[PDB]
Amino acid sequence: PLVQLAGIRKCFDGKEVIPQLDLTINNGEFLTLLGPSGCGKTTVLRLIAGLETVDSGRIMLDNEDITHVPAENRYVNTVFQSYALFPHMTVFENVAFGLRMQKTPAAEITPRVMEALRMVQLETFAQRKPHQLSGGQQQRVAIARAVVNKPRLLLLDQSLSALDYKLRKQMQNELKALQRKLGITFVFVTHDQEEALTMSDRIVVMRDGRIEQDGTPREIYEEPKNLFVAGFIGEINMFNATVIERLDEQRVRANVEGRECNIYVNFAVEPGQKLHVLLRPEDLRVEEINDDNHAEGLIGYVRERNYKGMTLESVVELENGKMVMVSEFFNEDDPDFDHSLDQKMAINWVESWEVVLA
Amino acid sequence: PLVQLAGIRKCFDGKEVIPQLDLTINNGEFLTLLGPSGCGKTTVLRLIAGLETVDSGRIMLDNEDITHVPAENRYVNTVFQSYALFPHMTVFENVAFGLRMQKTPAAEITPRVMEALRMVQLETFAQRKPHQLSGGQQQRVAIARAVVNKPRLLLLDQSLSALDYKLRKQMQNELKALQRKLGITFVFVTHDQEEALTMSDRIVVMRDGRIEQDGTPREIYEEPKNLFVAGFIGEINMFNATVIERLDEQRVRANVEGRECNIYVNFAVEPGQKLHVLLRPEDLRVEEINDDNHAEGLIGYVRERNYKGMTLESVVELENGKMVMVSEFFNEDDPDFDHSLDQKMAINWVESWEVVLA
Amino acid sequence: GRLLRGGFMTAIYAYLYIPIIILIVNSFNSSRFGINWQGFTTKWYSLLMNNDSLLQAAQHSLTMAVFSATFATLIGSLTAVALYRYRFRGKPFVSGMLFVVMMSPDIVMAISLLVLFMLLGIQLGFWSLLFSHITFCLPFVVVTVYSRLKGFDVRMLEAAKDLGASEFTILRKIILPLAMPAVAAGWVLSFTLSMDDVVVSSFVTGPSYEILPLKIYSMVKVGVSPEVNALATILLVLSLVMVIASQLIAR
Amino acid sequence: NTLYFYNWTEYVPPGLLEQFTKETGIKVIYSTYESNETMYAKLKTYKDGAYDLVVPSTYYVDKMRKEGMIQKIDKSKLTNFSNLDPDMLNKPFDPNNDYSIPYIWGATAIGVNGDAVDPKSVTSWADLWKPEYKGSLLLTDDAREVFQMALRKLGYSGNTTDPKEIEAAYNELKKLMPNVAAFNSDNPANPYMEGEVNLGMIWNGSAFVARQAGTPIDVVWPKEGGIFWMDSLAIPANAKNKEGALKLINFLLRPDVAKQVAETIGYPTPNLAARKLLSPEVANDKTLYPDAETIKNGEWQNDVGAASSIYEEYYQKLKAG
Amino acid sequence: TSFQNVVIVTIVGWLVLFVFLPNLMIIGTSFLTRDDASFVKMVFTLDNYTRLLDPLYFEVLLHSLNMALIATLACLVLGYPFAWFLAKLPHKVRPLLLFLLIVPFWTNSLIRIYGLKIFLSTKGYLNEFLLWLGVIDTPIRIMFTPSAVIIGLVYILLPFMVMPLYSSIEKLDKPLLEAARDLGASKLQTFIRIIIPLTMPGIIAGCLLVMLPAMGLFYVSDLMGGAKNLLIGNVIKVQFLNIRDWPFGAATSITLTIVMGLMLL
Ligand SMILES: Nc1ncnc2c1ncn2[C@@H]1O[C@H](COP(=O)(O)OP(=O)(O)OP(=O)(O)O)[C@@H](O)[C@H]1O
Ligand SMILES: Nc1ncnc2c1ncn2[C@@H]1O[C@H](COP(=O)(O)OP(=O)(O)OP(=O)(O)O)[C@@H](O)[C@H]1O
Ligand SMILES: [Mg+2]
Ligand SMILES: [Mg+2]
């Protein structure tokens, strides 16, 4: 347990941002923080570092009380969101500031700085001022300045937002390799959810200072725990169900959008409750229904398409008046009626694929 | 043709940044600009606005020459990247600056500002200084400041980067609604490619000041024209092929990675040529082969699997020594089959689904 | 448009420089009340090089100005940084004493400080003059540096602390270059204040540390000879060559 | 040893002091002061600092004997005391030259620019009160000189020490304000060389120096009288080296030294054995060196106790009309 | 924390030693009595304050304040455009011109005033020039008038307004100005709504440093405009060096400082 936060509480001008917070960070861990755009994520990172202090609680690092130790005495480093960059120095001095202040011998200042500059693909911009560069270049300079040292705890706050996709993949791999070879612990703040899910091994979701769900990047997607952590991670369509009869110890009959069907429930249930059934866009199948008679399948009408890349988002309205958000893969060269508009449509789902909640 | 750029050339400190350019922006259009982080997009946006006059060339807005007409006289508005936000004014004054500077009647200032703030979900933050806000709230204020004047041309420079997914979708929908209702032209520069394809009508890809390809959101992703536009818009596998003999036209026999197969080529080809065959990761089929005999397919071994949400990236290495990419839905979880590890399997496509380049 | 701007700037420069040319020219006239030209002569310069009691006044005044300005700018810069950033019990008391110094009628100071030095035993001369030339010239540098410091960007300070920065190094490297013009203005203002003083120094000095402005003011009885114009031309030439050397050599 | 000299900046010429050092091993360290009041205050407050020879005025040679700040001058070993005009020797501010020795003298009188105003049109103090001279008079900025002008116009003595007489002087001076154009704060010849003022108070030596620069400024002796002044040499009563000071006085009483001093600065000299050696036209110029009866039956600015405060308060009130 | 402690201790100690102790003596003297041959005696009186009720002192205070405010405004009006224009020139030239502005000010003030009086007098060079070329038939008289006092005060106290203003102007943030110009602004409205609120500290600093010293300059005014009007400096100087009533001078100085401080609120 490298870092422990117990009972940390913080208020700004009399209003609460973090009421209660218990958190543990270990060694060799990649931890990502996600949230609804304004709950609190930079406040936590600044509290962990030597910036603004805590009203009440305890911060422990390596089983040592550090709650009243300032900056310049903690072995942590940070990458800011506003690119806190010294405007009167070249790139080289910006990168070498951290090395110089720890009395690094003058022999290896240049090779290490040039190594970091090669890592971020900016070896040719060594002697250029910050106001002669652009957004991605400034951000890469900030990353390089933070990673030149060998800190045991690196806090990154939106460090890969101003780069293009192909370069973002290279930086993800670079950071992953550095973590694997050395042993740095990372606290990564982002809003791109796919990068969070690919790249990390614990993901913590927040809402107004409350920890809503903490788990490995697979339970965040496969098994949501509240209704908020289910409608935030991706696209999802919620169905209302009424339990009818308890069939088996893992099978329950329920009337859902007016059709009786079989679902998997793994907790106590009694005929008379209102349950939420959660399905994903890519788990539903659609089939044409030319015949007037309809059996074993929801009826709807397809309204528009989106074509968001490799996937063709499709909206189908039921007679009840609700969207369904059906998704698939776009096969243009396939001529077997990939797309057709304004027709009656049927939608079904494979059993034991849904998620059940109270 | 609302804006016409003819022969624009600009050099910074003696080095070429925009060599030569010819561009046309029409009415009621969504134009998105994509490039590799240093290409020169924001200089183009500044050249359109009154800032940063041209070294040589010519610009028309309708039929009148603005190439030397200063700012304060052009009817365009901009959303900056650095959030150029006044620190001595409230959010309210920041929003109403533009309204007041064109001598609006004093009665309509308050309702228009409050409508603009209700659009961006910041009604309660009306009387707070900028330095008390977060990054996302500052960016939302930046959008609201430019929107509230109702201009004919609106330029956005990474205006949806600091938000989460659900709010970003809402802002995309809101901007599209404004464009449909009023008739504004949008020049929007961004790095999120899925958002670029889902919400645009023309897409311009650039490199080192060159307009490499201009076309509809489908021509970029389905039929690239250059090798750079093929390696920048998404994930792709490229194979080398040599033509053997030409069958009936729209069908050509070629040897690719040691297998003779058919490729659909629609131009003149002579034997002995070397061609590039590009395939998308989702257009490959991977099939298990327990029998020792292999026929009609390239043979290789899977090396790792990646869990990217809703998909399952997989990389396979052939006996040749090359790694190629394959993708499929992973929420096919809870199956019977469909999980495996390092084995021997074959890769096969579906025919006439490839892209062929010289 | 450009023409009017140039006209304004050259008008102010003319207003400030056209009497200096008149002094330089009258340094060569034969009349001892230069209002007209009465011939070309170099008698005044030959008289000055031989006076051997005004040259020492110039040297003493230059040394006083240099040392007083350097220490005043250092102490004032530290005071301004302390008021802006550091947190201690009473700032209003510190601020008020600067205001009182800036409002002293310049006659009461020369008596209060004189009585104080005799009480304390400090010998009158070099040291007494320095300790009075530093005390004033302090509010000017404090006010200038505090005006420049306001509106500072705290992101740089936070990043420097994050990377590890003791108060000395962050002060020096981050604040000193970003607030350098205020420091230079303070230095030149302190220099120009420590050369026109005639009231405080006449009291707080001793039998042998005579300075130049005292001599000029006391010459009013017998008239001010063109000797002082000859001295002023030499000092102006030195000041000009010093900076045309400094700019050309390095920057 | 060494000698400390407290004097005006250029009152004793440089280079002239070099021969004193060549003849005698004494070297002089020279300290200068702005005005007599500063000299009084600095000398009274700083007792630790000791000076060796100081040059007061006619007022301040008095006021410094009664309060011990001045010392007796032993005239036995000043061998050149004969070379001095007896008219300036004995005066009511130093009874027998026991505490001072005259060094430089002068007078104050009406100065007229002959180019613009006829010199013979004005002949007395009272003619400055005529209504035609509106906005064209220059007056000296010190209370005692202006109040002496008024008192001599009325017919009283300069040191009246009677409040009733000062009241009449104040009332008379109140009528002169519409005529005043400036109160002079620097050398009297300076405002005349620029043409600002063509008639008013002036010192005779300044008029001589101004005429020697091409401006014809004549000086006319008022019938009521001329206001006299002189400077003197004295010892500050706390001196480490008294013999050096009393030798310096002897050196300054020589004929050739006096002639050089009177040549380098135009102000008259009290040596009678030295004005003969001067130029024929300089010694005979009647305004610079007036005739004997005017000098001996003259007014000198002696000390009046407790009434100087009245003069200064009235000078304050009169300006802020 | 040691460095901060040392800095604070040094700053407090210097100020207490060289400002507090003399002022305590001043206050103690202000409540005492005049005596010859000692300059002060041991009698407690309040008359040194109740003698300030005559109209003379209030009138001279008002006149001094009027001249100081006029000089301050004139320096502001003549100096703000100078700093703004100079802030636009290339970066290499700026320090050279800054120093060339101040090098005239490194000479004794009295000699400078002598030069100006030679320049502007009736028989000065300006009139002779404007006469030999035609125009100005009779000489233009400008000396010994209240306007000459203002000319001299500006001639002495110009940099004290320029340098604090240039320091504030140099640090202005470019993106804010670009955003304003892009939102449809104009030069006048940009000046009113942005530059002045962001440059006000420089204006306040310059105004203080030109106004407060201006009350002590009573010698340049005396030379350039006669002595036809009194100022507070002459009153205190005569109270100290000519009447030799030191307690009354102390009382006048303390009342002046209190009034000036309260006026600034
Ligand atoms: N100086 C401040 N004073 C008062 N309230 C503040 C201040 N800073 C932040 N707040 C409030 O704290 C809350 C959240 O703080 P914070 O900026 O850390 O959120 P965040 O999620 O990390 O940022 P983002 O929205 O970019 O994801 C916001 O409501 C914000 O308005
Ligand atoms: N002030 C400048 N002086 C000299 N060169 C500059 C300057 N600003 C930018 N450049 C150069 O312009 C090029 C990039 O131009 P531009 O800023 O228009 O695109 P960009 O900001 O990099 O796009 P993106 O924000 O997506 O990264 C860089 O090579 C950069 O070094
Ligand atoms: Mg943030
Ligand atoms: Mg950009």
Author numbering:
A (entry chain A), B (entry chain D): 16 to 373
C (entry chain C): 3 to 253
D (entry chain E): 27 to 347
E (entry chain B): 5 to 269
What does the literature reporting this entry say, word for word?
The PotD-PotABC protein complex in Escherichia coli, belonging to the adenosine triphosphate–binding cassette transporter family, is a spermidine-preferential uptake system. In general, ATP binding, hydrolysis, and phosphate release trigger conformational changes in the transporter, leading to the uptake of extracellular polyamines. Here, we report structural details of the polyamine uptake system PotD-PotABC in various states.
Through three-dimensional (3D) classification, we successfully captured the ATP-bound state of the PotD-PotABC complex. In the translocation intermediate state (state 3), ATP binding to the PotA NBDs induces dimerization of NBDs and conformational changes of the coupling helices as well as the transmembrane helices (particularly TM3 to TM5), resulting in an outward-facing state of PotBC. The binding pockets of the two ATP molecules are symmetrically similar along the dimer interface, involving the signature Walker A and Walker B motifs from one PotA protomer and the LSGGQ motif from the other PotA protomer (PotA′). In contrast, the two lobes of PotD are observed to be in an “open” form in the translocation intermediate state, resulting in the formation of a cleft wide enough to provide a direct pathway for the Spd translocation. The periplasmic loop P3 (residues 198 to 228, between TM5 and TM6) in PotC protrudes into the PotD binding pocket and is designated as the “scoop loop. The K223 residue in the scoop loop forms extensive contacts with the residues W34, Y37, N213, W229, W255, and Y293 in PotD that participate in Spd binding in the pretranslocation state. Given its chemical structure similarity to Spd, it is likely that K223 mimics Spd interaction with PotD residues and prevents Spd from rebinding to PotD, thereby facilitating its translocation to the cytosol. We also observed a large cavity (with a volume of around 200 Å3) formed inside the PotBC. However, we could not observe any Spd molecules bound inside this cavity.
